From a paper:
[name] proteins consist of an N-terminal [name] domain, which binds to DNA, a linker region with phosphorylation sites for network regulatory inputs, and a C-terminal MH2 domain that is phosphorylated by the receptors and binds other [name] proteins, LDTFs, chromatin readers, and transcriptional co-activators and co-repressors. The receptors for TGF-β, nodal, activin, myostatin, and other family members are membrane serine/threonine kinases that phosphorylate and activate Smad2 and Smad3, whereas analogous receptors for the bone morphogenetic proteins (BMPs) preferentially phosphorylate and activate Smads 1, 5, and 8. These receptor-activated Smads (R-Smads) form heterotrimeric complexes with [name], which is required for the transcriptional regulation of most target genes. Focusing on the human and mouse Gsc promoter, here we identify specific [name]-binding GC-rich motifs and provide the X-ray crystal structures of Smad3 and [name] bound to several of these motifs. The structures determined here reveal that the β-hairpin is flexible and adaptable to bind with high-affinity several variants of the consensus sequence GGC(GC)|(CG), which we refer to as 5GC SBE.
Residue numbers in the entry:
A (entry chain A): 9 to 130
B (entry chain B): 8 to 130
The structure:
DNA sequence: ATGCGGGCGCGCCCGCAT
DNA sequence: ATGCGGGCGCGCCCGCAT
């Protein structure tokens, strides 16, 4: 059942990462939201409507140094998912969170919002 | 750094059953674990450089949850790894039996595991 | 009913970029 | 000299051989 969800999210990718990298990052996030139906629904809504339909934060636990590893490569979780679904050429320090983003990376909370439509490019 | 001399003398006694990178990494890892265990580092050097003729006490490392130790991306049992490096280059998984005086043998399922290759026998 | 195995990531740490 | 990104290991996870 998560295969359908993963595939649907994968079709909205921009191609800034390898197929293996994007698949692994999407599967990892979906698994983290397994018992967070509201946040999984928010991600699907945000991604499949290309941000037109409003959504709440999609959060994952923050690691000791803030970085997330996917297929042997480390990076910030909000940059990883914003690079997958919105800016394929995205670099570090090119993101500013929106006013309504309660769990932004900049806020240095226990959890980090990875909703790509909760960030803006600079 | 003084540990270079120790890693070299222990490398001389390698049998060639593993790659240079694997042997170097495994020996460096063990030496680092014995950093504040002078008696156990001395026991290992004594055992290895005398080819087991000079008696030695147990050379122990902390046991991991599943017993396995990872070296250069490859997992295996710590007592089999070091027994393969200095004694039996063709050594496989359940080919080892500890000696009577081995107090921390793998087989005893204790907190610490003896990796002294001269504290085991082949079957 | 276990225990391999092997994939994979966070935490630790080294050695390399600055 | 030394802070920091990238390599690597133990723990977790899970399928399958034993
Ligand atoms: Zn948000
Ligand atoms: Zn022993």
């Amino acid at each position: 059942a998560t295969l359908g969800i993963v595939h649907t999210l994968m079709c909205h990718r921009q191609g800034g990462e390898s197929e293996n990298f994007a698949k692994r990052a999407v599967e990892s996030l979906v698994k983290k939201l397994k018992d967070k139906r509201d946040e999984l629904d928010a991600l699907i809504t945000a991604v499949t409507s290309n941000g037109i339909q409003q959504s709440k934060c999609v959060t994952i636990a923050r690691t000791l140094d803030g970085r997330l590893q996917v297929a042997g490569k480390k990076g910030f979780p909000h940059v990883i998912y914003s690079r997958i679904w919105r800016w394929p050429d995205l670099h570090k320090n090119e993101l500013k969170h929106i006013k309504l983003c309660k769990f932004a990376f900049d806020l240095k909370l226990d959890h980090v919002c990875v909703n790509p439509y909760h960030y803006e490019r600079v």
